[PDB]
Amino acid sequence: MWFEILPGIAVMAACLFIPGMATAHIHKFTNGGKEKRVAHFSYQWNLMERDRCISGVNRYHVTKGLENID
Amino acid sequence: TYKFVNMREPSMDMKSVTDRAAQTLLWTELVRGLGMTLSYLFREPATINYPFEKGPLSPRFRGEHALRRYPSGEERCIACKLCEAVCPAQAITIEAEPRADGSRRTTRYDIDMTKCIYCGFCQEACPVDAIVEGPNFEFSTETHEELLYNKEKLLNNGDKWEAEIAANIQADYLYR
Amino acid sequence: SRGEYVVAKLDDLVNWARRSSLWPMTFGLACCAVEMMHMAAPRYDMDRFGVVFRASPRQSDVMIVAGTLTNKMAPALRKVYDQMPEPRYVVSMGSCANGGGYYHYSYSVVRGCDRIVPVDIYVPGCPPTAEALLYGILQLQRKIKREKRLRIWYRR
Amino acid sequence: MFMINILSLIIPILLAVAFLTLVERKVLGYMQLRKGPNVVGPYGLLQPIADALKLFTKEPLRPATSSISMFIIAPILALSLALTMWVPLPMPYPLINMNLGVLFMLAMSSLAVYSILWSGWASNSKYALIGALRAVAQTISYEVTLAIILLSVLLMNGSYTLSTLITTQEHIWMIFTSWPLAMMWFISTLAETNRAPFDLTEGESELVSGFNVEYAAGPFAMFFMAEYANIIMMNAFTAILFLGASHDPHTPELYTINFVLKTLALTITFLWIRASYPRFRYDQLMHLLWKSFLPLTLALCMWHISLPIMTASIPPQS
Amino acid sequence: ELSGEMVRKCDPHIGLLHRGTEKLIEYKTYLQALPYFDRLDYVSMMCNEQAYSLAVEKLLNIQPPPRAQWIRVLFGEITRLLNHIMAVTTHALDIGAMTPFFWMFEEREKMFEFYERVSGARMHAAYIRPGGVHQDLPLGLLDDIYEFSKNFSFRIDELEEMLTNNRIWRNRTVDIGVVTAEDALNYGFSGVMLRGSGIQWDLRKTQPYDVYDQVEFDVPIGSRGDCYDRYLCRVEEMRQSLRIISQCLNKMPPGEIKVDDAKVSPPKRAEMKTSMESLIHHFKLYTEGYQVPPGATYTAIEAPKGEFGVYLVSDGSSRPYRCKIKAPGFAHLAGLDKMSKGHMLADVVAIIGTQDIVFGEVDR
Amino acid sequence: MELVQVLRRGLQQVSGHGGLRGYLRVLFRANDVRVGTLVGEDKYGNKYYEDNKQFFGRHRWVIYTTEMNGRDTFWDVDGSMVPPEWHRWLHCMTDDPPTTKPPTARKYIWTNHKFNVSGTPQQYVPYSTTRKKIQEWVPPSTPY
Amino acid sequence: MNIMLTLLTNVTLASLLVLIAFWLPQLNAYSEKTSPFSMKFFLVAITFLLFDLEIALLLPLPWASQTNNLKTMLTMALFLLILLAASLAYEWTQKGLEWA
Numbered sequence A: 001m002w003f004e005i006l007p008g009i010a011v012m013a014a015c016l017f018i019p020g021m022a023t024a025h026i027h028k029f030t031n032g033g034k035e036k037r038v039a040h041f042s043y044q045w046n047l048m049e050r051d052r053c054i055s056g057v058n059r060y061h062v063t064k065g066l067e068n069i070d
Numbered sequence B: 001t002y003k004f005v006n007m008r009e010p011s012m013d014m015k016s017v018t019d020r021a022a023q024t025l026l027w028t029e030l031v032r033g034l035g036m037t038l039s040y041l042f043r044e045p046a047t048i049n050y051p052f053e054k055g056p057l058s059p060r061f062r063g064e065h066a067l068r069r070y071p072s073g074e075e076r077c078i079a080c081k082l083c084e085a086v087c088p089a090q091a092i093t094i095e096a097e098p099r100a101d102g103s104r105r106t107t108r109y110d111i112d113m114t115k116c117i118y119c120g121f122c123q124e125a126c127p128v129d130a131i132v133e134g135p136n137f138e139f140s141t142e143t144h145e146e147l148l149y150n151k152e153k154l155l156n157n158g159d160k161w162e163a164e165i166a167a168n169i170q171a172d173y174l175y176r
Numbered sequence C: 001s002r003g004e005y006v007v008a009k010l011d012d013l014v015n016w017a018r019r020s021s022l023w024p025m026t027f028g029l030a031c032c033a034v035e036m037m038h039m040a041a042p043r044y045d046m047d048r049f050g051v052v053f054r055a056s057p058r059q060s061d062v063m064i065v066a067g068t069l070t071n072k073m074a075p076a077l078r079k080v081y082d083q084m085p086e087p088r089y090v091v092s093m094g095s096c097a098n099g100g101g102y103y104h105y106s107y108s109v110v111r112g113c114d115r116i117v118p119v120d121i122y123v124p125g126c127p128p129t130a131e132a133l134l135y136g137i138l139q140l141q142r143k144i145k146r147e148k149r150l151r152i153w154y155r156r
Numbered sequence D: 001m002f003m004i005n006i007l008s009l010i011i012p013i014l015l016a017v018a019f020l021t022l023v024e025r026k027v028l029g030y031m032q033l034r035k036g037p038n039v040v041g042p043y044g045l046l047q048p049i050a051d052a053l054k055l056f057t058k059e060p061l062r063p064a065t066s067s068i069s070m071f072i073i074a075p076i077l078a079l080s081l082a083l084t085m086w087v088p089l090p091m092p093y094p095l096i097n098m099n100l101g102v103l104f105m106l107a108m109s110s111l112a113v114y115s116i117l118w119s120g121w122a123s124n125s126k127y128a129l130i131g132a133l134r135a136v137a138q139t140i141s142y143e144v145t146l147a148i149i150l151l152s153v154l155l156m157n158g159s160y161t162l163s164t165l166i167t168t169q170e171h172i173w174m175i176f177t178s179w180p181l182a183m184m185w186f187i188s189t190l191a192e193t194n195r196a197p198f199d200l201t202e203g204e205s206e207l208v209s210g211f212n213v214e215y216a217a218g219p220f221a222m223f224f225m226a227e228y229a230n231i232i233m234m235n236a237f238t239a240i241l242f243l244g245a246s247h248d249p250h251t252p253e254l255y256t257i258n259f260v261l262k263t264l265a266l267t268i269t270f271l272w273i274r275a276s277y278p279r280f281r282y283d284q285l286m287h288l289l290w291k292s293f294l295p296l297t298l299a300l301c302m303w304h305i306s307l308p309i310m311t312a313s314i315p316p317q318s
Numbered sequence E: 001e002l003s004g005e006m007v008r009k010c011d012p013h014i015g016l017l018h019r020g021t022e023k024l025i026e027y028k029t030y031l032q033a034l035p036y037f038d039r040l041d042y043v044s045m046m047c048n049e050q051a052y053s054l055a056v057e058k059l060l061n062i063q064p065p066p067r068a069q070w071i072r073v074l075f076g077e078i079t080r081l082l083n084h085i086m087a088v089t090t091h092a093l094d095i096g097a098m099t100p101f102f103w104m105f106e107e108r109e110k111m112f113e114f115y116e117r118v119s120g121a122r123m124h125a126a127y128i129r130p131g132g133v134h135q136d137l138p139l140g141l142l143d144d145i146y147e148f149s150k151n152f153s154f155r156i157d158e159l160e161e162m163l164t165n166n167r168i169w170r171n172r173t174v175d176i177g178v179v180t181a182e183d184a185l186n187y188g189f190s191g192v193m194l195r196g197s198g199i200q201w202d203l204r205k206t207q208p209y210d211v212y213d214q215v216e217f218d219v220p221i222g223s224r225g226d227c228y229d230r231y232l233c234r235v236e237e238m239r240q241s242l243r244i245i246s247q248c249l250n251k252m253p254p255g256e257i258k259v260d261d262a263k264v265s266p267p268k269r270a271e272m273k274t275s276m277e278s279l280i281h282h283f284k285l286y287t288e289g290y291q292v293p294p295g296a297t298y299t300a301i302e303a304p305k306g307e308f309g310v311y312l313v314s315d316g317s318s319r320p321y322r323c324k325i326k327a328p329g330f331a332h333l334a335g336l337d338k339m340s341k342g343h344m345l346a347d348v349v350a351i352i353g354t355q356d357i358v359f360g361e362v363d364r
Numbered sequence F: 001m002e003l004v005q006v007l008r009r010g011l012q013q014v015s016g017h018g019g020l021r022g023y024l025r026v027l028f029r030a031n032d033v034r035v036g037t038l039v040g041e042d043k044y045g046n047k048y049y050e051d052n053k054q055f056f057g058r059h060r061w062v063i064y065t066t067e068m069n070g071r072d073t074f075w076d077v078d079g080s081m082v083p084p085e086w087h088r089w090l091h092c093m094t095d096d097p098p099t100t101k102p103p104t105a106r107k108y109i110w111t112n113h114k115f116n117v118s119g120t121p122q123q124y125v126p127y128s129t130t131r132k133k134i135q136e137w138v139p140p141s142t143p144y
Numbered sequence G: 001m002n003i004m005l006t007l008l009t010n011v012t013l014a015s016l017l018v019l020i021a022f023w024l025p026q027l028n029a030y031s032e033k034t035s036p037f038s039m040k041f042f043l044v045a046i047t048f049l050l051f052d053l054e055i056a057l058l059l060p061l062p063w064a065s066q067t068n069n070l071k072t073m074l075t076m077a078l079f080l081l082i083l084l085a086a087s088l089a090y091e092w093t094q095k096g097l098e099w100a
């Protein structure tokens, strides 16, 4: 009956779910377990560039904390 | 004696005007139609699982013609040609000669299923219940020539379907 | 041979694709169109089998000649058949379309649609019951299943 | 890995389109007391494969004989733009994060009409050319309201950035704020996607097949895929714009599930509408937009400009 | 001829389904000629059979038995329900509704089952014949008809819910195909086409043919003469047909189903097999047929698509000399051009739908 | 709740068809996984089931045999495979199954039902059943 | 480079499908198959253009709401919207909106 429609909807649901989960996890993998930083304004990009210089491995997601000080 | 469809005047009171304005702006009637379709979605479908499930038929069904025999095995048809006369599409061609036993039998009985209209005549005319449209309906063919039946084909159909045909005639012979 | 095996499996695949998705064209001249619609009706719904009515001859795969084919209508029927892409199959429904039926001796009736276009499956009846039409369509599907196009190509 | 992300966006969307076809068929059947395709595979799951293979193996007719370059570009443009419009959508993190992704999607939708425009013309037929013209008018007519309604609702977002829509609707759906705009926007999506009751373009009952009457086998399949991909994408845009979803930053899966379910609901609504209502007459279609909708959209745009000022609810720009 | 989407000139070309029916009738006996009338209007077969039966009976000066007449009126109303279902649902399909098609075609399948039970043919049966009806109703059929009719009202109500008050549906039909009452009368329109314009004429009341004088029903009358009013009339006529069906179910008489005259109606099988007179008459009836007294008549009935008439002239032989069929769709398709003026293509589709035209009737 | 009951009924359907393998078998062959009372089985192997609870038109159904008349019918099944005795029960022409009410036994009746043979070497070929009408003169064999 | 990559990939994929659908199935062996009125209603299209211009003029409004002279901004925004409404009303009343 009407439940027979459900399997196609479920396959479509999985297919639609795949890209969002893929994007989230790819961002996590590329940005070191943190969300990809969002730079909608030049100040945020300047912060990202400063982090890249500070990291020393030329990767912004690498974060240097109080340990680098003194 | 007569009824007026339409011919109704809407009320002009503020409540009725507000209701109709709501219907126009808020799409109420469209929502009602949508709800009807939704209910039909949740209703059980009427499809039968052909070929595993077959549509109902009555004993008087008119399908593939089938020449029948007597219980002794002698072919019932007695070359009366009454069927050829009533045939409204002249799909029946009958030729007869006295057979060796001396009985009046048909040397040729051809029913062109490509010209026949499945009227049910002949079945109601044959004085000896010879040609009787059988219950079979799924006898489609891949070539035109297969549908030009011969007396041998009709007798084979009768032999094949006699078990059902006799029962159907028994069911309906009192109504006739 | 391995090549024969690959060819046979590919032909099975293409035949299955063609028979599963049979798109008849919305072509009904006379009474048998009513029984055709009843086949499309919920009881014997053709869409379960992959049979979907598509108006465009260019987007259609099977032509069901449901009705009496008159001399005036015959050239149009031939034209619509020709504009239909291949593989194309023709199913003749009704005594009128098969051989002229009730109007076989009419001056204005083509005595069978086989004279105008080739016919693959003939569905007897006047009108053929919708179940008979569905049976004819399934017989056409089996006929497609038996096709050996790629096998014959490999054998040459 | 960015190419991997592109493929992950593209291929599943195409598979979703393929199975959306089956879903449509079964839903329409059940609302018509019928059963959808079920012979081909368990519960009909293999029907789209059969349909695609049958289409591809079918004869490639082409009596266009005019600007074959255009006759080939039109399917390419349609499919490419349908795939591209999915890119900026945040689900919840967008593939490409644009400050103006909304205007990007509007521009891509406007461009996608050229696919119908060229296909019908390069076909060089009667129904094809006139049907293509009717298409231009339809999409063009509703593009106006689409933009106005979109601007009116984003006045609360504070930007054209799609991602911030999640933040704006964190506490409540924007449908509660702008349901009249939501209704008009939904009808607008229906018109833009050329779906019933506005399926005038193809318009099988009136025009044999419309702009795709001279397109067969694969190019017709690409037009079908573009159409259905546009349907899913527009419903996803509706879901993001109005039916916002909770997003936990640490677990994006919850938002992704909620968003996918809402988009599925809206697509099922599209099929439901296709089943219920008959088709609007070409003339009535335009009458409903320029004379009936366009006004109310202007009034609501004035209101949605005025409300943040008089309620001191101007959203933050960033 | 279309300027833009406006129809400047609408010219109907017919004969694509002309099968020379009237010519072929001359070469057949009356009983052989009966099956053609089933084919003439495929949606309303039994009504055409009844019209031909009335013509041959009137020329024959023979009267059908009362039970045959009540069976005829019952199946005439069943046929009217079928025809209206097809007309309203296919009109809706052509303008894009599409769902009521399947909804009501399930009921059509059930009514076809009733046809099959009486005659053995789902459609194009030979049930109604000169002199009455071929076979009596199989036991248990009437109660099944009761079961069907008691629920058909909900189905037609659901159809109204889908279409009657829908804004789109009204916009497609509220004022298209307007016909003046005098223009409708002059152009030869009949049935709803007349009643939609507001003229009050139903042959079932004005000139009752079989037992319609003994049944109570209301003729639906429209007020603006448009497609929407015709839609309303068709739906109401269906409701009144359901009422007539209830009445006929309640008061079906007992007795014979064909005239007790073996020179016109064939004798019963047992009688033809046991009595010499019955066999002689059976032989002559199924070979030569019954001679009709010479004369001519035009007998008209309120067929579901309008007035259906047969101008039957007899030369005293067993085969009619001339048989002219008046198809209600002929005049409607003729006036299609007048109706279409000032309208667009889609409106032309709607007008074609409103004139319930079956081209078997038009072409003959 | 009734939903749990429906799920358990689905599990009962899985069990009743002989397990998961039989469930998949009937699902792929017939597209229907209902379990019904087995009324009987013809000689050819077709099994006939009845479920009066289902609405009219689905209360009776047949599972076609995998092999009939030397043809593999696991996937290719046809309506003609139904023998005439069970045909009337299947198509609702009678309410009594052939097992309950056997058909009358006659010598001429076929003992093995043949399905539609079109497209096969067994296909019927039309031919005239009458002998030559005009007989020609036979010339004499002597030179003169 | 990300947006350029996306554009390239999508275009190439669609064009690849068009190739596999215009040439790949064209190999399959077959045989021979043989084989405007001046729209004055285009005025609607022209009016769309002049309305699309106002559409463009209205897009900056979300950032326009961030100014300190909100009074002037609101007055000018409503001025543009009222002029658009006046244009629509004029075309409506002068039967200029003669669609189809």
Ligand code: SF4
Residues within 6 Å of the ligand: B065, B083, B086, B087, B088, B089, B090, B091, B092, B111, B115, B116, B117, B118, B119, B120, B121, B122, B123
């Ligand atoms: S059913 Fe066919 S064969 Fe029999 S009398 Fe009628 S037309 Fe002739």
Ligand code: SF4
Residues within 6 Å of the ligand: C030, C031, C032, C066, C067, C068, C093, C094, C095, C096, C097, C101, C102, C125, C126, C127, C128, E039, E124
């Ligand atoms: S075969 Fe019978 S039902 Fe079919 S078109 Fe001819 S007369 Fe009509």
